Design a protein around this ligand. Sequence first.
Ligand SMILES: [K+]
Ligand SMILES: [K+]
Ligand SMILES: [K+]
Ligand SMILES: [K+]
Lengths: 73, 76, 73, 73, 76, 72, 74, 259, 260
Amino acid sequence: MQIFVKTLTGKTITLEVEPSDTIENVKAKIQDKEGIPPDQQRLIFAGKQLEDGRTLSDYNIQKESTLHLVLRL
Amino acid sequence: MQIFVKTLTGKTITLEVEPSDTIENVKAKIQDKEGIPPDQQRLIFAGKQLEDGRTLSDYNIQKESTLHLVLRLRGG
Amino acid sequence: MQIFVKTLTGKTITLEVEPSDTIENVKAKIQDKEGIPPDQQRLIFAGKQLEDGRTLSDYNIQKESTLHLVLRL
Amino acid sequence: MQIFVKTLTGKTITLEVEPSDTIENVKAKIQDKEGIPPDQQRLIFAGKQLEDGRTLSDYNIQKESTLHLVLRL
Amino acid sequence: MQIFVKTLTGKTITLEVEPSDTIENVKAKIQDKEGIPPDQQRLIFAGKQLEDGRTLSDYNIQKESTLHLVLRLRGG
Amino acid sequence: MQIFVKTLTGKTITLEVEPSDTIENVKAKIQDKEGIPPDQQRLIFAGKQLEDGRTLSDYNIQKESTLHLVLR
Amino acid sequence: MQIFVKTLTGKTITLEVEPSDTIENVKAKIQDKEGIPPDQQRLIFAGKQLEDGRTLSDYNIQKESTLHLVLRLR
Amino acid sequence: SVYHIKWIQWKEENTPIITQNENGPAPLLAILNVLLLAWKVKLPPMMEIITAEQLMEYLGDYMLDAKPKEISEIQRLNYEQNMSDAMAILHKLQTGLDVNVRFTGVRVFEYTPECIVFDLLDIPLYHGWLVDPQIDDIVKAVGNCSYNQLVEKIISCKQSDNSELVSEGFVAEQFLNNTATQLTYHGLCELTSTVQEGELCVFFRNNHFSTMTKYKGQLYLLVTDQGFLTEEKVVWESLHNVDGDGNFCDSEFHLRPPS
Amino acid sequence: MSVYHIKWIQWKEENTPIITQNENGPAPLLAILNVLLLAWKVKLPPMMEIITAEQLMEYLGDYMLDAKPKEISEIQRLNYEQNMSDAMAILHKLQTGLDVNVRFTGVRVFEYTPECIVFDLLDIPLYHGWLVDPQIDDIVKAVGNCSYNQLVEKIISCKQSDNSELVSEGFVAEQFLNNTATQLTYHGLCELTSTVQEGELCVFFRNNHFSTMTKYKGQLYLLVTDQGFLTEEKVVWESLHNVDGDGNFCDSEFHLRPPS
Ligand SMILES: [K+]
Ligand SMILES: [K+]
Ligand SMILES: [K+]
Ligand SMILES: [K+]
């Protein structure tokens, strides 16, 4: 499954994920792509922040959904 | 229906509910017996965390089923 | 299990308790040895007050833990 | 079974012991009569120092034997 | 005769001794096979520590018996 | 298991070792990764020199331990 | 009487003396063999420091007994 | 809610600390006592009590007055979003703050919105709930799991058919029971060496937030309970064991004699 | 017999010598004397670059006699003389290795053996950090108040028992000795940091080695005494803050050494 994460800068990253993937693995995939470490990441979907231990399917994040990435600095 | 809620300390709580109560309402019944704030409550069943908007039937929770109550670490 | 409570005057009291004991019960066990009524007792562990309605297990009080005893106002 | 413990000055005390008693135990029995902590005691028999974990029988200490106690400061 | 010495290093050593061998000579034979100095060695048999002045007969150590070799803590 | 070897320059070399390895086998693993020959390596742990002929087990070297490396 | 003077490093020397000798004469006889200045010499017996003006008989030093030698280095 | 103020002689200056009664407002008092002891927030010296609304008005005023004026466009937008999310959560500081620790480091928490309040004030957040690395059984069972993940792993492992996972859950459960005060001796070590001298920071332990500091290499916790309000010489408690048997010290970190 | 190189460092603004180690063995003698040298109670000629074991042994024994205590009753004097003789008799073992028997309940808790007398007569505290974690009641019960010498005997006895409780007590006590093989635990580090006084010079037993220990600004440091660092003027003290042996090297004024 393909989902997008969008930063406040506007840069959009495409990720190939599974529904059973946890948010921790999603943050690890952004770690491998954009270089941002996971504990300096905030992902938002539908206005709520996503917990590391939950999965995309726990938030009903399905095909072609757009996540919002807020950075920590 | 009657379901059981097990804590990490080993205690088992009996709750009288229905298949149609929301998870938020089940947490309110736990608060009435244990005083635990619902926002601090995390219920686990079949390896899934029960979300407050859904109902017990959404998670296929049966009669005499056992839910696991773990708490968020709340600093006070 | 046994726990200790320490006053500001330096006195150390040894109590026999159970994790399921409420703080009101441990204050009653203090009264049995010192005579201070639970209405005058304030119990502190690790800087946090032990509220009379909760239990020892609620505060994770381990065996041989030292609690601090002060009079309230 | 009774053995004697003599100080360097010459003071002799009697202890009720068993051939299976460790010398830690007889050091504690000396503490009961004479008040020295066991870790401030040094017991000598047949010209050699006795080890805390051994028993009286390991060193062949028989009845009416005399141990020598040396203090530390 | 032949006896076994079990170490805490996970190995069992075979020794050629005689009943008249002093405990020190047994430790010297351990020094020749494992390099441990004799005064650092502590030999355990029957839950008893074999003292240096005695011989193997005094502890009734017969053939194919197993001693346990534990070391003192030597700082260096 | 893996252990770390830190030099006076701040460089840290990660080594894959076993408790049964001798100190010479550790100095040769340093030579396979670093340019220093075993004849020029001196290895220290907790202030004590790790002498040639001994094993890592003789010095109780645990996993994720840091050894110090300096000229012979 | 036969006395033995041993240092901590392990050098033990046998000396011939009498019980009526004083400790000054004892370290003077040790200087006669090893060549050690006597005021750089400290003599121990039974864990007790030996005074210059006392005798071997005052400390009850017996035959075939060992005295310990400590050198007063700079 | 009203809080009593305790005036202490802190670094030879009349300094106030906020003092707690009922359980709940420790997050708000831990943050503000860091700011008060740091003289970043100053209270009129006549005040004896203060309400929560004033406390957070002082807090919100400081966060806006501490905005980094020289920041890139990427920093401004992210600060902007983090600020907004932090205020929507700010009310929780007065009732209790949810944390999710990991057991691999004193600074390691899940980056939840409850952590933003500390980042925006440059206030470090610490815990001492660390695994003992010498026990490889616990290191494997606990792993890089957060607390929230670990309890779920214990739930799932107890019903597994894999014998290894069943044992992993048992060890993880034992670890959570043995270390229930949320402080271990490995954690106490790492804290003592990670916290800098004189650093004012927040310490999470046993579902509580404390204002922590280090003085001459020893860690101390500000005494914030109303029981010690009139005790001039009970200002800091030393943190040198897990039993809670700390030493009470005056505002100059000198041991309070029994009285 | 054996020679040791001397390192001259700036200790409390004064040129002070410390003894350096090459081969394994002499750590007990060097840890004791490096305490005396850092305390300026034993002083060497300012030029000496290298010293043999004999002068170190004589310098030490010379100080033991000059450190005779006053205000001692005849009971204390008799017990002192017996202790002084036995300590001198075993003094040679300082350069080959000293036998220690710890108990795992306190940083100052050893068996009072004659090799402890040397530290008593010099008032040099002896420490270890081999402590049981009190939050694990399994190990606290299994190890109890056993010394090391007793615990290995308990493990051997328990490993062949038919009592299910005893076999588990031995298995746990065996697990403890293997997990904590470097003879330092994090509970020991915490008790050491809070027990050692600021500025105190003492001796530290760890991983079959003796180190000179002190505390500065609340941090424990170990005196660097290996000859690999003999020419490193900036490597004098090593911080003790973990069981990994990954300490921070510091100069003679406890300032961090820059990587070069
Ligand atoms: K005697
Ligand atoms: K001010
Ligand atoms: K002023
Ligand atoms: K035993």
